[PDB]
Point group: C4
Chain length 93, copies 4
């Protein structure tokens, strides 16, 4: 319960950092900087864009390292203790 | 047995939601909307396309979150209790 | 020991199927069809290309499902019981 | 403690090998070769570029195999025993 809330806020602040960086350093639109931030951390990736400034490239490097860990954690638990009991509850005869 | 069937139907409805959204909001061909839906959730990604409407971008965001969890689950078990005993059965002398 | 060899041959036959399909249906060069096959299953993805025939798109769909499971398994164990004792052996004082 | 340092240096040497290969064989700028090396191993991928020489393609193949294992290991533990106690320490009332 209080672990989803935590790993949620840490993901919010993580995504906030990226949206400000890319919307500032790389010149993306806020919504675009958010998307890029989301697709890189979940490792989906963006097919239409890549960081054009060496600054953006180095940030993205450290960003991926500090991020892939905590972003997927929220993906695991967002299901494990949230999406799961919700789907178990629909099965029960 | 009845867990593969479940995580299968939840993946069907998940993929259905995406195919309708992208084929409607982003204007992709049904088969294309399906592909995009599949490559984003398995995190492979699409190199030829990215959501062009801010609507599609936000949907994809929430879509990736609610999806990467249950899609890989079907990938894990589709093997664990299906692909595996099938390959163990071919080894037995 | 005999588990790396197995998950290795299953990955060989998996990669072989893809290289023939893409080099035939999509018209890629053998080496290119192999690369695409490798980057899609490890979920890295290809930024320069996507299946252009609906046949290639549907194959890739089923291909990703039957594949991401067994390809990463070889990635896990290729390290766990191969890359690891090799690196533990270099540490020992 | 001494396991983060290890999996860190193995990732440094891994990333070094790639940066030299791509900056030499594919003709990327050092910083670009590094980025590509990072995005392929974490499976994020690059949307703006793909290996253009068959040499680069085959290297990338073996590179992804020997790499995805040890790179994510550093991602797991970089959090587990580093990012985690750091975040647990901020919660304590
Ligand atoms: K990925
Ligand atoms: K990717
Ligand atoms: K592209």
């Amino acid at each position: 319960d209080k672990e989803f809330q935590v790993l949620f806020v840490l993901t919010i602040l993580t995504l906030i950092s990226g949206t400000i960086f890319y919307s500032t350093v790389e010149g993306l639109r806020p919504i675009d900087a958010l998307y890029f931030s989301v697709v890189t951390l979940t490792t989906v990736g963006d097919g239409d864009f890549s960081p054009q400034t060496d600054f953006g490239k180095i940030f993205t490097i450290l960003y991926i390292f500090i991020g892939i860990g905590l972003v997927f954690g929220f993906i695991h638990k967002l299901a494990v203790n949230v999406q799961l009991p919700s789907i178990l509850s629909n099965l029960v005869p």
